[PDB]
Amino acid sequence: MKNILSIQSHVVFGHAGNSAAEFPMRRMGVNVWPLNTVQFSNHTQYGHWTGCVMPASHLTDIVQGIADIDRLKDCDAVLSGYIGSPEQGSHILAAVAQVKQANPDAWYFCDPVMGHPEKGCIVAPGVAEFFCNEALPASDMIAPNLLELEQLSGERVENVEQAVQVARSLCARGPKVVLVKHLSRAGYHADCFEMLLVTADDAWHICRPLVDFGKRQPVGVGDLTSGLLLVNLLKGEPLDKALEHVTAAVYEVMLKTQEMGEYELQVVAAQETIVTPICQFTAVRL
Amino acid sequence: KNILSIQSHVVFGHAGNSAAEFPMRRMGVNVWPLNTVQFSNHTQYGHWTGCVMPASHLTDIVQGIADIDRLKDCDAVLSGYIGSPEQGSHILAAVAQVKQANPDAWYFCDPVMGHPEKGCIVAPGVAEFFCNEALPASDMIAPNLLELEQLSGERVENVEQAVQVARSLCARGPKVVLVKHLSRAGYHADCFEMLLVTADDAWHICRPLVDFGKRQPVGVGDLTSGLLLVNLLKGEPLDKALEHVTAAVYEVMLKTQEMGEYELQVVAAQETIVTPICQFTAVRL
Ligand code: NA
Ligand code: NA
């Protein structure tokens, strides 16, 4: 069994962060050690929530506890997404460093969440700086959307050719794999959702139809995309097959959500189409 | 169907919510995991790191779900191991608030106190909490032989006595009693046995004993309790509900044993949770 230490938010009702990624990743047959950074009643896009943020020192305490039972060496990858403060981020990188000492083959998959290209930045002060100068150099894979790829590089990205080159420039600072999870305006077609998977030797481009949720877009699509890519890569899937599975599995969860008229991403109702999607999307090697 | 599950969370391994959440979601029921603690691993390792959530955090979370008008979607509240009477009283306040939002909601109480062979493991305040407070508020309970004797104050020597004592606990609140581990009160020392009791009927079931040596895997009771609530919420007949739970838990224990693991292998055994290969037949008494 492959084992992921996933350090993300937890919501009691609904799905976001670890609450969006844990059940789909376990459904695919990979273990998830869910190290919850918060415990909130619901995600923040309802405009109100109750609960609490865990002390940043709690995150490194947990990791020490797993090392104390000599199980930290079983961790094959660390996954991070939304980060509420630079202090929390520094403790997540301390967890990554501790895991790699116990297991030198462990990967750090960083979703550098900063916001949606259509809405703008939603991160707390200092978090953008933390991703650019701290998380990026320590990462083995990163999954920036267009807004995050531009923030991390400090460059405008206008098309796929540029996105590949800019992704390869971020790679030189640390990660070996870059997933441009949301191309946005830099894509080929305005009527299509697009993603790009980049390595040193290759780049794959993939397309799928847009899902119009209108005013209330469900939270967790990025969290699910990042988590499912990590699972496919840990399971030894070729990069093109990995991208194709993620693209179709996420799309099917989104369709199920819209069909049920729900605001929350329906990760449990769509579980059969997560492992075996009906929809098939094919990547194009650039 | 939606379950608000208020139990422990362990980052590595499986106990409490970490044992029950994935299997119940695998069965197609939603789980709202209200974690009472966040620990590095369960306490039977003999050491752990992490913390206990403040008891007021539990009722704070329930209010937040009521604030988004979603508490009415809750079909059941599930509880297991409780660390203190204070945590316990906040769990019952959560149950009362859910029942106000949804009068058809059930409270499933696993009254954990200890193992019938290893003995009690909770403070006496917690045993008093289950007898005085948790039992009158429950709709279903899943005591092992030790817990069934603690709640009734009577010695239970056999299945006939177990059925009578279970119905005596029902007059005190619950409509369904699962004697999750019969222990010495069972018919056969060589069999693992359980009993499902209602006002009109009682079902008995057996399955082989699984030998794990000195280190007994944690969470068997948590998984049993969780999977029974799922079967009842999905409207399974009581005999079919007992048969599925008995076989699905056994399959998880078989997978754990064949892998030589200490942790209950709830993810590796996921295919046999929904569709067990083993078949065990319940007998109506
Ligand atoms: Na596009
Ligand atoms: Na027996």
XYZ file of C-alpha atoms and ligand atoms in Angstrom:
573
model
C 0.000 0.000 0.000
C 1.120 3.572 -0.791
C 0.704 6.121 2.076
C -0.008 9.884 1.825
C 0.336 12.344 4.737
C -2.242 14.929 3.687
C -1.973 18.246 5.712
C -5.067 20.297 4.866
C -8.270 21.777 6.306
C -11.125 19.620 7.682
C -14.799 20.604 7.472
C -17.365 18.564 9.526
C -20.251 19.212 7.094
C -19.405 19.107 3.400
C -16.206 18.857 1.416
C -13.023 20.975 1.190
C -9.291 20.319 1.716
C -8.803 16.947 3.437
C -12.622 16.555 3.562
C -12.682 16.722 -0.294
C -9.555 14.610 -1.023
C -9.383 11.916 1.736
C -12.369 9.718 0.746
C -11.607 9.802 -3.095
C -7.905 8.982 -2.485
C -8.756 6.055 -0.133
C -11.468 4.936 -2.665
C -8.629 4.560 -5.259
C -6.775 2.202 -2.857
C -4.107 4.499 -1.352
C -3.809 5.219 2.399
C -4.424 8.762 3.667
C -3.022 9.967 7.009
C -5.284 13.034 7.380
C -3.420 15.667 9.437
C -6.151 18.298 9.731
C -4.945 21.905 10.007
C -8.386 23.134 11.182
C -11.726 21.697 12.231
C -14.519 23.955 10.955
C -18.295 23.361 10.772
C -18.259 24.031 6.973
C -16.034 25.686 4.344
C -15.535 29.488 4.449
C -17.446 30.275 1.186
C -20.775 29.988 3.075
C -19.677 33.390 4.569
C -19.724 32.012 8.159
C -18.411 28.956 10.072
C -17.557 27.797 13.624
C -14.602 25.760 14.827
C -10.913 26.358 15.280
C -7.480 26.488 13.651
C -5.001 23.957 15.086
C -1.806 25.502 16.642
C 0.996 25.373 14.007
C 3.179 23.462 16.588
C 0.426 20.713 16.714
C 1.272 19.727 13.085
C 4.944 18.960 13.922
C 3.858 17.259 17.186
C 1.696 14.814 15.193
C 4.568 14.040 12.789
C 6.892 13.351 15.787
C 4.235 11.000 17.198
C 4.149 8.977 13.948
C 7.989 8.854 14.022
C 7.762 7.663 17.736
C 5.886 4.491 16.625
C 8.524 4.071 13.756
C 5.825 4.458 11.051
C 6.933 7.783 9.500
C 9.278 5.773 7.153
C 6.054 4.281 5.573
C 5.046 7.742 4.229
C 5.454 7.847 0.404
C 4.277 11.456 -0.072
C 3.256 14.666 1.708
C 0.311 16.636 0.238
C -0.534 20.254 1.032
C -3.162 22.640 -0.278
C -4.660 25.745 1.254
C -2.476 27.270 3.976
C -3.934 29.878 6.397
C -0.663 31.557 7.490
C 3.121 31.518 6.819
C 3.669 29.964 10.323
C 1.403 27.070 9.364
C 3.312 26.795 6.118
C 6.688 26.657 7.835
C 5.447 23.781 10.087
C 4.154 21.927 6.965
C 7.668 22.194 5.407
C 9.187 20.983 8.713
C 6.833 17.916 8.385
C 8.039 17.401 4.748
C 11.734 17.578 5.923
C 11.058 15.085 8.745
C 9.266 12.615 6.412
C 12.153 12.753 3.849
C 14.662 11.952 6.644
C 12.572 8.833 7.527
C 11.954 8.003 3.846
C 14.389 9.593 1.316
C 12.135 8.476 -1.629
C 9.068 10.435 -0.281
C 7.601 13.171 -2.549
C 6.257 16.604 -1.606
C 3.172 17.514 -3.728
C 2.323 21.188 -3.207
C -0.963 22.716 -4.433
C 0.095 26.434 -4.076
C -3.394 27.809 -3.470
C -3.701 31.576 -3.847
C -7.082 32.030 -5.532
C -9.201 31.635 -8.675
C -8.117 33.425 -11.926
C -11.704 34.788 -12.344
C -12.128 35.993 -8.670
C -8.596 36.921 -7.534
C -6.293 36.295 -4.509
C -7.898 34.920 -1.325
C -4.730 34.120 0.656
C -3.626 35.692 3.945
C -0.679 38.127 4.066
C 2.748 36.441 3.660
C 1.313 33.179 2.191
C 2.108 34.153 -1.456
C 5.719 34.942 -0.406
C 5.878 31.600 1.520
C 4.863 29.640 -1.613
C 7.336 31.452 -3.943
C 10.437 31.378 -1.685
C 9.769 28.420 0.663
C 7.291 25.803 -0.609
C 8.370 25.906 -4.273
C 12.121 25.105 -3.581
C 11.118 22.147 -1.299
C 8.453 20.711 -3.705
C 8.764 17.707 -6.018
C 5.489 18.474 -7.768
C 3.422 21.633 -7.899
C -0.085 22.264 -9.232
C -0.571 25.984 -9.817
C -3.589 27.346 -11.701
C -2.949 30.264 -14.165
C -3.056 32.972 -11.363
C -0.648 30.876 -9.191
C 1.709 30.073 -12.128
C 1.943 33.891 -12.792
C 2.412 34.727 -9.068
C 5.198 32.097 -8.608
C 7.074 33.192 -11.773
C 6.284 36.951 -11.668
C 5.538 36.633 -15.418
C 2.413 37.118 -17.562
C 1.354 33.825 -19.220
C -0.661 34.331 -22.454
C -0.681 30.835 -24.083
C 0.220 27.084 -23.759
C 3.757 27.587 -25.300
C 4.563 30.231 -22.613
C 2.908 28.130 -19.793
C 5.225 25.181 -20.663
C 8.365 27.462 -20.642
C 7.305 29.276 -17.395
C 6.497 25.822 -15.758
C 10.020 24.615 -16.714
C 11.481 27.804 -15.111
C 9.625 26.978 -11.812
C 11.011 23.394 -12.124
C 14.622 24.733 -12.030
C 13.812 26.165 -8.554
C 12.745 22.702 -7.200
C 9.875 20.498 -8.547
C 10.207 17.848 -11.290
C 6.498 17.875 -12.271
C 4.211 20.873 -12.847
C 0.467 20.540 -13.263
C -1.129 23.726 -14.620
C -4.465 22.743 -13.093
C -6.421 25.598 -14.666
C -5.164 27.259 -17.883
C -7.969 29.827 -17.940
C -7.409 32.553 -20.557
C -4.025 31.071 -21.491
C -5.811 27.967 -22.905
C -6.567 27.244 -26.594
C -10.390 27.543 -26.472
C -12.585 29.842 -24.303
C -15.404 27.202 -24.221
C -13.146 24.483 -22.735
C -11.629 23.736 -19.298
C -7.920 23.030 -19.885
C -4.885 21.611 -18.016
C -1.199 21.069 -18.715
C 1.173 18.424 -17.263
C 4.878 19.346 -17.640
C 8.151 17.394 -17.039
C 11.777 18.017 -18.201
C 11.330 15.837 -21.356
C 7.551 16.197 -22.087
C 4.322 18.224 -21.810
C 0.707 16.987 -22.194
C -2.289 19.152 -22.829
C -5.878 18.038 -21.998
C -9.371 19.549 -22.541
C -12.869 18.924 -21.165
C -16.221 20.845 -21.437
C -16.983 23.647 -18.922
C -19.503 23.016 -16.131
C -21.596 26.122 -15.514
C -22.441 26.332 -11.813
C -23.225 30.025 -12.198
C -23.050 32.091 -9.020
C -22.139 29.299 -6.568
C -19.144 27.238 -7.763
C -18.504 24.197 -5.429
C -15.336 24.332 -3.320
C -12.694 21.573 -3.533
C -12.252 20.983 -7.312
C -8.554 21.984 -7.024
C -8.136 19.881 -3.843
C -9.662 16.828 -5.614
C -7.575 17.400 -8.820
C -4.284 17.638 -6.864
C -5.083 14.629 -4.619
C -6.131 12.361 -7.512
C -3.037 13.264 -9.545
C -0.793 12.355 -6.593
C -2.610 8.979 -6.211
C -2.242 8.148 -9.967
C 1.509 8.979 -9.906
C 2.112 6.990 -6.676
C 0.240 4.011 -8.247
C 2.818 4.105 -11.101
C 0.483 5.424 -13.812
C 2.170 6.889 -16.942
C 1.898 10.721 -16.937
C -0.569 10.836 -19.870
C -2.854 8.130 -18.303
C -2.630 9.852 -14.885
C -3.738 13.199 -16.405
C -6.613 11.511 -18.370
C -7.957 9.727 -15.265
C -7.861 12.923 -13.085
C -9.520 14.994 -15.864
C -12.455 12.559 -16.301
C -12.860 11.606 -12.550
C -13.058 15.296 -11.441
C -15.497 16.133 -14.304
C -17.818 13.246 -13.263
C -17.880 14.397 -9.598
C -18.798 17.927 -10.877
C -21.592 16.569 -13.139
C -23.028 14.464 -10.243
C -22.945 17.585 -8.013
C -24.877 19.649 -10.642
C -27.342 16.768 -11.346
C -28.196 16.559 -7.631
C -28.533 20.385 -7.424
C -26.000 20.437 -4.560
C -23.531 23.142 -3.561
C -21.102 20.649 -1.931
C -18.845 18.568 -4.211
C -20.526 15.113 -4.207
C -17.346 12.995 -3.612
C -19.336 10.111 -1.920
C -22.335 9.996 -4.389
C -19.853 9.966 -7.362
C -17.506 7.279 -5.869
C -18.063 4.621 -8.621
C -17.171 7.168 -11.382
C -14.034 8.289 -9.409
C -12.434 4.837 -9.759
C -14.043 4.143 -13.211
C -15.199 7.320 -15.059
C -17.717 6.861 -17.941
C -16.404 10.033 -19.689
C -13.055 9.644 -21.480
C -10.698 12.530 -22.259
C -7.454 12.063 -24.163
C -4.273 14.034 -23.551
C -2.260 15.460 -26.493
C 1.562 15.348 -26.241
C 2.910 18.807 -27.250
C -28.511 9.401 4.494
C -26.268 11.544 6.748
C -24.499 10.541 9.983
C -22.960 13.025 12.415
C -20.170 10.842 13.918
C -18.608 12.287 17.123
C -15.528 10.192 17.868
C -11.701 10.192 18.096
C -9.486 10.864 15.070
C -6.003 9.333 14.664
C -3.733 10.636 11.881
C -1.905 7.302 11.443
C -4.027 4.186 11.576
C -7.641 3.522 12.467
C -9.700 4.022 15.611
C -12.929 5.906 16.329
C -13.874 8.071 13.372
C -10.707 6.955 11.587
C -12.016 3.320 11.703
C -15.664 4.001 10.844
C -15.727 7.047 8.448
C -14.204 5.434 5.303
C -16.272 2.135 5.585
C -19.566 4.007 6.164
C -18.879 6.370 3.199
C -17.842 3.255 1.155
C -21.416 1.967 1.901
C -22.914 5.132 0.268
C -23.909 7.053 3.435
C -22.551 10.531 4.252
C -20.411 10.957 7.369
C -19.923 14.365 9.062
C -16.817 13.554 11.095
C -16.831 15.682 14.255
C -13.460 14.623 15.628
C -13.220 14.758 19.477
C -9.365 14.591 19.368
C -6.533 14.678 16.840
C -3.879 12.135 17.860
C -0.810 10.811 16.008
C -2.009 7.219 16.628
C -4.390 5.360 18.989
C -3.461 5.099 22.708
C -2.951 1.272 22.665
C 0.533 1.873 21.180
C 1.244 3.036 24.791
C 2.186 6.570 23.698
C 0.922 9.233 21.260
C 1.063 12.993 20.489
C -1.735 15.428 19.634
C -4.589 16.928 21.619
C -8.181 16.594 22.857
C -10.591 19.126 21.437
C -12.273 21.384 24.086
C -15.755 19.922 24.893
C -17.376 23.315 23.943
C -15.791 22.919 20.422
C -18.234 20.032 19.797
C -21.351 22.152 20.455
C -19.696 25.107 18.558
C -19.412 22.868 15.437
C -23.107 21.703 15.726
C -24.246 25.395 15.954
C -22.266 26.223 12.767
C -24.041 23.431 10.831
C -27.394 24.767 12.213
C -26.257 28.297 11.016
C -26.103 26.996 7.379
C -29.586 25.273 7.859
C -28.074 21.806 7.321
C -28.502 20.273 10.787
C -32.035 19.129 9.690
C -30.328 16.837 7.078
C -28.790 14.748 9.892
C -30.431 11.248 10.005
C -28.365 9.992 12.992
C -25.784 10.850 15.627
C -23.131 8.220 16.336
C -20.905 8.099 19.412
C -18.267 5.695 20.678
C -15.358 6.152 23.022
C -15.764 9.224 25.257
C -12.787 10.699 27.198
C -14.660 12.482 30.009
C -18.232 13.053 31.352
C -17.869 16.731 30.079
C -17.213 15.563 26.479
C -20.115 13.153 26.995
C -22.545 15.911 28.102
C -21.635 18.009 24.994
C -22.274 14.947 22.750
C -25.783 14.610 24.296
C -26.394 18.386 23.806
C -25.467 17.788 20.103
C -27.985 14.884 19.992
C -30.743 17.077 21.529
C -30.040 19.923 19.031
C -30.084 17.494 16.031
C -33.383 15.939 17.243
C -34.901 19.453 17.399
C -33.764 20.088 13.742
C -34.921 16.598 12.665
C -37.408 14.754 14.943
C -36.823 11.502 12.962
C -33.051 11.439 13.773
C -31.599 8.511 15.759
C -28.908 8.414 18.404
C -26.647 5.329 18.125
C -24.535 4.956 21.310
C -21.660 2.480 21.513
C -21.185 2.647 25.350
C -17.451 1.921 25.397
C -15.987 1.161 28.815
C -13.540 -1.680 28.145
C -13.058 -5.220 26.793
C -14.771 -8.283 28.484
C -11.322 -9.999 28.809
C -8.921 -6.993 29.401
C -11.355 -5.123 31.711
C -12.592 -1.551 32.048
C -10.475 1.329 30.663
C -12.612 4.494 31.352
C -13.016 6.740 34.467
C -16.087 5.884 36.761
C -17.577 9.238 35.761
C -17.775 7.927 32.162
C -19.541 4.651 33.252
C -22.041 6.750 35.326
C -22.491 9.092 32.286
C -23.481 6.081 30.075
C -25.919 4.673 32.665
C -27.565 7.922 33.807
C -27.365 10.174 30.721
C -26.448 8.363 27.459
C -28.806 5.393 27.900
C -32.076 7.450 28.374
C -31.181 9.583 25.262
C -30.239 6.586 23.017
C -32.314 4.876 20.270
C -29.763 2.109 19.751
C -26.887 0.836 21.929
C -24.122 -1.692 21.236
C -22.697 -2.927 24.543
C -20.258 -5.827 24.795
C -20.883 -8.281 27.664
C -18.898 -6.091 30.174
C -20.881 -2.966 29.175
C -24.262 -4.850 29.209
C -23.522 -5.950 32.830
C -22.348 -2.398 33.821
C -25.511 -0.691 32.439
C -27.938 -3.211 34.028
C -25.946 -3.923 37.233
C -26.605 -7.680 36.662
C -24.369 -10.673 35.837
C -25.139 -12.149 32.387
C -24.216 -15.839 32.071
C -26.037 -16.850 28.867
C -27.837 -15.680 25.667
C -31.323 -16.214 27.284
C -30.305 -13.859 30.149
C -28.622 -11.468 27.628
C -31.959 -11.122 25.698
C -33.883 -10.329 28.981
C -31.232 -7.896 30.289
C -31.067 -6.199 26.786
C -34.887 -5.634 26.867
C -34.592 -4.253 30.449
C -32.117 -1.588 29.047
C -34.654 -0.742 26.298
C -37.309 0.278 28.903
C -34.686 2.794 29.878
C -34.443 4.273 26.381
C -33.204 2.489 23.248
C -35.380 0.372 20.901
C -32.450 -1.699 19.527
C -29.665 -3.415 21.493
C -26.663 -5.012 19.826
C -24.677 -7.209 22.225
C -21.541 -6.696 20.116
C -19.354 -9.201 21.962
C -21.074 -12.027 23.906
C -17.788 -13.252 25.440
C -18.399 -16.014 28.121
C -22.219 -15.500 27.787
C -22.099 -17.015 24.253
C -23.084 -20.620 23.400
C -19.599 -21.706 22.198
C -16.195 -20.687 23.640
C -14.626 -21.346 20.146
C -17.027 -18.829 18.388
C -17.195 -15.019 18.237
C -20.843 -14.241 18.861
C -23.279 -11.305 18.775
C -26.912 -10.722 19.553
C -29.375 -8.227 18.009
C -32.399 -7.479 20.204
C -35.704 -5.600 19.584
C -39.045 -5.648 21.553
C -40.512 -8.438 19.315
C -37.412 -10.389 18.185
C -33.808 -11.480 18.884
C -31.158 -12.768 16.432
C -27.958 -14.684 17.313
C -24.889 -15.060 15.051
C -21.443 -16.748 15.110
C -18.207 -16.374 13.221
C -14.699 -17.817 13.710
C -12.294 -16.240 16.216
C -9.349 -14.386 14.673
C -6.075 -14.815 16.598
C -3.898 -11.649 16.548
C -1.689 -12.764 19.485
C -0.623 -10.221 22.147
C -1.564 -7.099 20.064
C -5.365 -7.014 19.475
C -6.219 -4.494 16.636
C -8.234 -1.455 17.817
C -11.539 -0.367 16.233
C -13.468 -3.670 15.787
C -16.283 -2.314 18.018
C -16.135 1.072 16.239
C -16.471 -0.624 12.827
C -19.267 -2.983 14.075
C -21.297 -0.068 15.527
C -20.773 2.122 12.416
C -21.700 -0.570 9.868
C -24.837 -1.544 11.897
C -26.107 2.071 11.906
C -25.524 2.251 8.095
C -27.524 -1.022 7.509
C -30.415 0.176 9.696
C -30.443 3.677 8.068
C -30.567 2.010 4.583
C -33.649 0.017 5.754
C -32.125 -3.475 5.835
C -34.121 -6.182 7.690
C -32.573 -6.714 11.180
C -31.371 -10.316 10.341
C -29.789 -9.117 7.018
C -28.254 -6.094 8.849
C -26.661 -8.404 11.463
C -25.410 -10.854 8.723
C -23.768 -8.095 6.657
C -22.115 -6.423 9.698
C -20.793 -9.815 10.998
C -19.335 -10.755 7.569
C -17.952 -7.268 6.601
C -16.148 -6.881 9.986
C -14.744 -10.452 9.709
C -13.429 -9.668 6.168
C -11.580 -6.579 7.480
C -10.092 -8.674 10.336
C -9.049 -11.434 7.794
C -7.336 -8.850 5.545
C -5.585 -7.342 8.598
C -4.309 -10.818 9.705
C -3.099 -11.909 6.205
C -1.123 -8.629 5.885
C 0.442 -9.136 9.375
C -0.798 -5.660 10.398
C -1.675 -4.238 13.825
C -3.966 -1.549 12.276
C -7.475 -2.602 11.031
C -7.075 -2.674 7.249
C -10.288 -0.791 6.391
C -8.918 0.521 3.006
C -7.261 -2.728 1.720
C -10.543 -4.636 2.560
C -12.944 -2.013 1.034
C -14.316 -4.368 -1.701
C -15.337 -6.983 0.937
C -16.985 -4.272 3.175
C -19.685 -3.619 0.565
C -19.846 -7.242 -0.736
C -18.462 -9.775 1.791
C -17.303 -13.162 0.333
C -17.846 -14.839 3.766
C -21.481 -15.571 4.616
C -22.709 -16.008 8.199
C -26.301 -16.892 9.027
C -28.235 -15.314 11.916
C -30.724 -17.467 13.869
C -34.016 -15.991 15.218
C -34.505 -17.024 18.889
Na -9.910 27.095 -22.269
Na -18.572 -17.660 22.086
